[PDB]
Amino acid sequence: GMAEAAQSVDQLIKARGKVYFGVATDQNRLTTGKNAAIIQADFGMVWPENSMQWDATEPSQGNFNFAGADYLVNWAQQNGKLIGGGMLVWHSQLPSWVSSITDKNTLTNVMKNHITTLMTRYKGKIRAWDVVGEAFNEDGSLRQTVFLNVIGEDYIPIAFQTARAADPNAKLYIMDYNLDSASYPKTQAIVNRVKQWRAAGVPIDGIGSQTHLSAGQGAGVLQALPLLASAGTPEVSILMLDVAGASPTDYVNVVNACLNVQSCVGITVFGVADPDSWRASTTPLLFDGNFNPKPAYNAIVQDLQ
Ligand SMILES: O=[N+]([O-])c1ccc2nn[nH]c2c1
Residues 6+ apart with CB under 8 A from 146: 91, 94, 98, 99, 101, 107
Angle between helices 155-166 and 104-121 (to 10 degrees): 30
Residues 6+ apart with CB under 8 A from 34: 3, 272, 273, 291
Ligand 1 atom 9: the closest Cα is on which residue? 86
Ligand 1 atom 1: the closest Cα is on which residue? 239
**Ligand 1, CB cutoff 6 Å, lining residues:** 24, 47, 49, 84, 86-87, 130, 239-240, 268, 270
Q: How far out from the chain centre does Cα 105 lie?
A: 29
On the 0-12 / 13-18 / 19+ scale of CB atoms within 10 A, 131 is buried
Chain breaks in the chain (C to N over 2.5 A) after: none
| In contact, 132 and 175? CB cutoff 8 Å | yes
d(CA 300, CA 9): 7
Beta partners for residue 172, in sequence order: 129
Q: How far out from the chain centre does Cα 100 lie?
A: 27
d(CA 99, CA 272): 33
Q: What is the DSSP letter of 294?
A: P
- How far does the centroid of ligand 1 lie from the alpha carbon of residue 21, in Å? 13
Residues 6+ apart with CB under 8 A from 182: 188, 220, 223, 224, 227
d(CA 26, CA 276): 12
SS3 state at 14: helix
Best residue among 19, 92, 130 to mutate for probing ligand 1, ranked by most atoms within 8 Å of CB? 130
| In contact, 244 and 282? CB cutoff 8 Å | yes
SS3 state at 288: coil
- How far does the centroid of ligand 1 lie from the alpha carbon of residue 47, in Å? 5
Work out whether strand 264-269 and strand 82-89 pair parallel, antiparallel, or are unpaired.
Answer: unpaired
Atom of ligand 1 nearest to the CA of 268: 1
- How far does the centroid of ligand 1 lie from the alpha carbon of residue 253, in Å? 21
> Is the link from the previous residue into 87 a cis peptide, with omega within 30 of 0?
yes
Annotated domain spans of the chain: 1-305
Q: How far out from the chain centre does Cα 29 lie?
A: 18
| In contact, 178 and 190? CB cutoff 8 Å | no
Q: What distance, in Å, lies between the first and last C-alpha atoms of the chain?
A: 25
- How far does the centroid of ligand 1 lie from the alpha carbon of residue 2, in Å? 30
Which helix (H) or strand (E) element contains residue 177? strand 171-177
CA distances from 274 to 88, 177, 184, 293 (A): 27, 20, 28, 11
Best residue among 19, 47, 119 to mutate for probing ligand 1, ranked by most atoms within 8 Å of CB? 47
Tell me how crowded residue 220 is: count the other CB atoms within 10 A of its CB. 22
Angle between helices 155-166 and 185-199 (to 10 degrees): 60
d(CA 33, CA 92): 28
Q: What is the dihedral of CA 270, 93, 83, 187, to 10 degrees?
A: 60
Residues 6+ apart with CB under 8 A from 255: 13, 267, 300, 303, 304
d(CA 257, CA 237): 10
Cα Rg, the chain, nearest whole Å = 18
The Cα diameter of the chain in Å comes to: 61
Q: For residue 26, which of 86, 75, 90 has the smallest C-alpha distance?
A: 75
Residues 6+ apart with CB under 8 A from 115: 88, 89, 131, 159, 162, 163, 166
Residues 6+ apart with CB under 8 A from 78: none
d(CA 229, CA 193): 13
d(CA 295, CA 277): 17
Buried b (16+ CB within 10 A) or exposed e, 54-82: bebbbeeeeebebebbebbbebbeeeebb
d(CA 293, CA 156): 39
